[PDB]
Assembly symmetry: C3
Homo-oligomer: 264 residues x 3
């Protein structure tokens, strides 16, 4: 069955559907998530004020919220992007800041909450504990409009708005690329390679791609640099590590700059 | 003379053709290798049972031998790939496992044997000794069917089967790309950048590419993470290292994940 | 005003135009530089003897000045390249060596001199001091004839010769790509990400690209591996570092091999 499933976060938190969820994580590594605090209403408000900015902000206003290095980490990047994390943000105005701080907080809360359920369903206690693992280094990227890749996050949450009905996002499921359209009521979750790693290979990190024939909100839940894991265990589930020794950190593995995606 | 030469491994091991071999290594960095234990017969048997799998394995059978992260390190990857190393392998069946373990062992033995001859012909004693250097981290990748690159291996061994007579693989030789067709009786060896490094610049790592108008078996002989070398010597033969200090490891140089190829 | 400005190095060294220069560095991160010791006359002499080599050097002569790994770090690379740094160079002849050593020295002197002025205008004292910072690991690449990128240098100096009048190089300025043609009398300076980093975000690293419808001399002023910086400060100006701890080195950040450019 190559259906992309949907889970209620609330139901998962109540201990329901645990075998289904575990099988989804192992066999597919993607699902829609409902009842997680992330509404089309709220997306709508953040989306409107950032589109207003992209459409109608002077370039002086844009330059004030442009980083001096064009990394798409914070602020505006000209298809146009707006990026945020938990600090060091660049905001065009008081109203924008209120709306986007709130939006970011809800995405971060939902992402930590579903990651907690991924860890619980797989029996996983990260080295250093669950809450230090989840208090991490997220990145939110909003785009206004691929070669297939997998994400290097723990999980990635994706909200979309639809086209005037072309479906750009596709993921591999049961060995075929499958449409992943917008859902009013739901966020799309992709498991990333860090889920695979931390859980000892119990979670798939699916390949996906964004096709050209919209907007996308992508939240990457990314571990801290000092996230530590077992090297021989990494080797058991397909990681081609060049790491001496029995344990390593995320920094050891990926290097000194975050890397969000990888191709085969 | 831009011919790609052929050497008998047995003859090399008997101390013959040493000046020719050394000049080949320095000026070309590629050659066919005969008398190394690698036969079209044996390729044929491994090739048949993996093609049978690619052709006729259910997707359930394929999923069982698919890694949760799509790294093409172990198991099946869908042009289709099957990958192996010395441990943590994923095998579709008892018969497959017997055949491919044997095939892998012969490739690993041939690769270590020609690397030993590369080191001997160049007077090279790796830090830590020859046998610890060669007891390493190989990767075998079988493909069923480029931008030019060089390999980052010590050596790479390549077996091919021919097309129904187009020649896909080409390498730079004397400043032109030259066809490298299948040879019944021989394996194709490319020297990689680690040969250049370990030998102090006595071995070329040739650029090559796979052209679109078949199958390929590619064995990468890759050093351990703790392989140690001299930084100033690396600088003398063209390595643009950013390494503080007088010595470094392969992990220091390449990072926490193996990197098998590099472009200019 | 999206003009690419021009500064006299001599005037900058006399303390003139400091507010203009600072605003250029912050808002644009590129400028032409006159009065820096870099003449079309001198370019002409180095260019003629390397073109003579590219045109009329036998392949045996080319192989003698070809590195065994094709990294484009030193010597000849076949559009054709010739590369140099402060040592370990490969020169085709006595006359070539005299001319190119001199040319390299003038480029290195000009690059250090404008970097010194970037640091002074921004109030910047690198950890370890200015002169240890500038006594670094430059790379000169001459090409005989893109996806947009930024440079990871401190500064990059670019001399060009014109086409028979197409303008290949373009950079983002005030949110549009702008032609950067040859100037007889001037060198083009791009600030790189290390300028952004060392100065605490006071310098832009502009995106740029080389368009297909000539020659280019590109000098990268690149820090030493042990160049040390503040991690939280790196985070403040857009660097998406995965670095544990309060300070880090360039090697920590970029890895064991120099990386000269980066895309978004
Ligand atoms: Fe993705
Ligand atoms: Fe290759
Ligand atoms: Fe550049």
């Amino acid at each position: 069955d190559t259906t992309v499933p949907t889970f209620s976060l609330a139901e998962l938190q109540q201990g329901l559907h645990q075998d289904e969820f575990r099988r989804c994580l192992r066999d597919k590594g993607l699902f829609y998530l409902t009842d997680c605090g992330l509404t089309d209403t709220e997306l709508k408000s953040a989306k409107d004020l950032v589109i207003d900015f992209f459409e109608h902000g002077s370039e002086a206003e844009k330059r004030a919220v442009t980083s001096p290095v064009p990394t798409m980490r914070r602020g505006f990047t000209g298809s146009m992007c707006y990026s945020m994390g938990t600090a060091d943000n660049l905001f065009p105005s008081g109203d924008f800041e209120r709306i986007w701080t709130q939006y970011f907080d809800r995405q971060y809360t939902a992402s930590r909450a579903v990651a907690r359920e991924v860890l619980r369903a797989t029996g996983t206690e990260p080295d250093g504990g669950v809450e230090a693992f989840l208090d991490c280094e997220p990145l939110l990227r909003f785009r206004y409009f691929m070669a297939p890749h997998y994400d290097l996050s723990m999980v990635t949450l994706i909200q979309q708005t639809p086209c005037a009905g072309f479906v750009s996002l596709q993921a591999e499921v049961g060995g075929a690329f499958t449409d992943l359209p917008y859902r009013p009521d739901a966020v799309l979750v992709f498991c990333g390679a860090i889920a695979t790693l931390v859980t000892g290979g119990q979670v798939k990190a699916p390949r996906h791609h964004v096709a050209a024939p919209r907007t996308s909100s992508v939240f990457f839940l990314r571990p801290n640099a000092d996230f530590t894991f077992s090297v021989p265990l990494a080797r058991e589930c397909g990681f081609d590590v060049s790491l001496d020794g029995e344990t390593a950190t995320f920094q050891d593995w990926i290097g000194g700059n975050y890397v969000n995606i990888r191709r085969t």
